[PDB]
Amino acid sequence: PIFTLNTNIKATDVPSDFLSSTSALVGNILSKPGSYVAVHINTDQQLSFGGSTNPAAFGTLMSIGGIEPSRNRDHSAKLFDHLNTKLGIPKNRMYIHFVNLNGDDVGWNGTTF
Amino acid sequence: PIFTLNTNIKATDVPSDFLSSTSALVGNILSKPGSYVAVHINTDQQLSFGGSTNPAAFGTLMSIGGIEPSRNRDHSAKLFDHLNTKLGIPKNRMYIHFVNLNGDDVGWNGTTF
Amino acid sequence: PIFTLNTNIKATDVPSDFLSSTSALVGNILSKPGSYVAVHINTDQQLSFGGSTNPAAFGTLMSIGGIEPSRNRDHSAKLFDHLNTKLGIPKNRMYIHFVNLNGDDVGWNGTTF
């Protein structure tokens, strides 16, 4: 799995345990081993949400399986609570695109799944 | 909707009204309220187009379209003019991936559409 | 085509010819002219793989044609070999999402393809 986020907040405002806590949450919610979980946060970005440059973010959570309509609502509740808690960004100022990948479209270790 | 752009131009060359003006523009072409519009630009990126590192950019415009047409050609013309007039970037050196999102795959305010 | 990659390695650690050789390679594997190839690398990113911030990366390769289930494993072997050589990043610490694009949803110049 990959969780990638773009935000306008400052890097110094991302806690030291952000990558670990996010890696843990992503693996636990998608039921994937932590060794396959990648987390990325791009901070200090020029980003406007709803016409304001106040703290906001948008990102994507992609994974081969574990993601589908009948599950994204729960995924969202947990991820938004987590991000609001760690970065302090309001839940109505964040978007997350959930993507269910096909193994054949994902390269890893020089091969595909 | 979300409009995110990556480009190799300097951050200083981006107009201070870019975000506000791009946000209003996006809400217009997609006929979506500004309250749901997010705009993001990542500048100073190491980006080569056609083998040269001259001014160029690539991005995505995502929105939940549902039971509606495409209009990507009209969107691209209106968007490229905007980006070209505002950033001065050559239109033949910019790609824009148009993505029609399914509400169930989009997380917002701790829930999904 | 567009090959965009995010990595935690330092910007100066990216060889001056990375964009050049990568552009040539992408064009080669997809049988596409270099003039339509865009390569992007976002370095110095806060990114973990398996919870570790040791060298790692993830990216996307998108193209209107050339990307298909029957072709991506060969693309992967070639791209991972190239990235591991150029960037020194272990192959089991990189992900590449292969995306085949429809010309109808790709903006260039001022219209689509």
From Swiss-Prot, chains A, B, C:
Entry keywords, A to Z: Cytokine, Isomerase, Secreted
Record EC number: 5.3.2.1, 5.3.3.12
Residues engaged in binding substrate: K32, I64
Residues at the active site: P1
GO molecular function: cytokine activity; dopachrome isomerase activity; phenylpyruvate tautomerase activity
Reactions accelerated catalytically: L-dopachrome = 5,6-dihydroxyindole-2-carboxylate; 3-phenylpyruvate = enol-phenylpyruvate
A single Gene Ontology CC term: extracellular space
Keyword Ribosomal protein: no
Domain of life, per lineage: Eukaryota
InterPro entries per the UniProt record, alphabetical: Macrophage_inhib_fac, Tautomerase/MIF_sf
The UniProt record lists the keyword rRNA-binding: no
Induction (UniProt): Inhibited by free fatty acids and haematin.
Cellular location(s): Secreted
Database matches in Pfam families: MIF
Chief site of localization: secreted
Protein function: Tautomerization of the methyl ester of L-dopachrome. Inhibits migration of human peripheral blood mononuclear cells.
Family: Belongs to the MIF family.
Protein name (Swiss-Prot/TrEMBL): Macrophage migration inhibitory factor homolog
Organism: Trichinella spiralis (Trichina worm)
